[PDB]
């Protein structure tokens, strides 16, 4: 079942470049998905569990989103930190908050993200 905003072929789900946000992302994706394209949306973080509910995912394309590296990014960060190679994710960059702006997502630590939600 291909989520409404996206185009699917095989086990590729193309949801790129569609103005998606956390609020508007599909709540689930075909459980057999192996490649998910989210490049070039409006995402600042990913809902908890979205990528972990995709147990066959090989690669996710996540670049060109305005990622905010705070505590809402703890789930994406965990997923990235668990990948077998982080180099394919080196185009993922934090735009905010100022203390993490310019950092690459795959090398963030969890504690940094907790700290980035300070009052
Ligand atoms: C996505 O962000 C762009 C760039 O700021 C904005 O113009 C556009 O309205 C947003 N699209 C949606 C669907 O929110
Ligand atoms: Mg968002």
From Swiss-Prot:
Subcellular location: Membrane
Glycosylated residues in this chain: 42
Keyword S-adenosyl-L-methionine (UniProt): no
Record-annotated LRRCT domain positions: 65-119
Membrane topology according to the record: Single-pass type I membrane protein
LRR repeats by residue range: 36-59
GO molecular function: identical protein binding; transmembrane signaling receptor activity
Keyword NAD among record annotations: no
Span of domain LRRNT: 3-31
Tissue and organ expression note: Expressed in heart and brain.
Disulfide bond residue pairs: 2-8, 6-15, 69-94, 71-117
Alphabetical keyword list: Bernard Soulier syndrome, Blood coagulation, Cell adhesion, Disease variant, Disulfide bond, Glycoprotein, Hemostasis, Leucine-rich repeat, Membrane, Phosphoprotein, Signal, Transmembrane, Transmembrane helix
Biological-process GO terms, alphabetical: blood coagulation, intrinsic pathway; cell adhesion; cell surface receptor signaling pathway; megakaryocyte development; platelet activation; positive regulation of platelet activation; release of sequestered calcium ion into cytosol
Cellular compartments per GO CC: glycoprotein Ib-IX-V complex; plasma membrane
Lineage top rank: taxon: Eukaryota
Extracellular-side positions: 3-119
Remaining remarks: Platelet activation apparently involves disruption of the macromolecular complex of GP-Ib with the platelet glycoprotein IX (GP-IX) and dissociation of GP-Ib from the actin-binding protein.
Function of the molecule: Gp-Ib, a surface membrane protein of platelets, participates in the formation of platelet plugs by binding to von Willebrand factor, which is already bound to the subendothelium.
Subunit structure: Two GP-Ib beta are disulfide-linked to one GP-Ib alpha. GP-IX is complexed with the GP-Ib heterodimer via a non covalent linkage. Interacts with TRAF4.
Disease field: Bernard-Soulier syndrome: A coagulation disorder characterized by a prolonged bleeding time, unusually large platelets, thrombocytopenia, and impaired prothrombin consumption.
Stated name of the protein: Platelet glycoprotein Ib beta chain
Residues represented out of the complete protein: 26 to 143 of 206
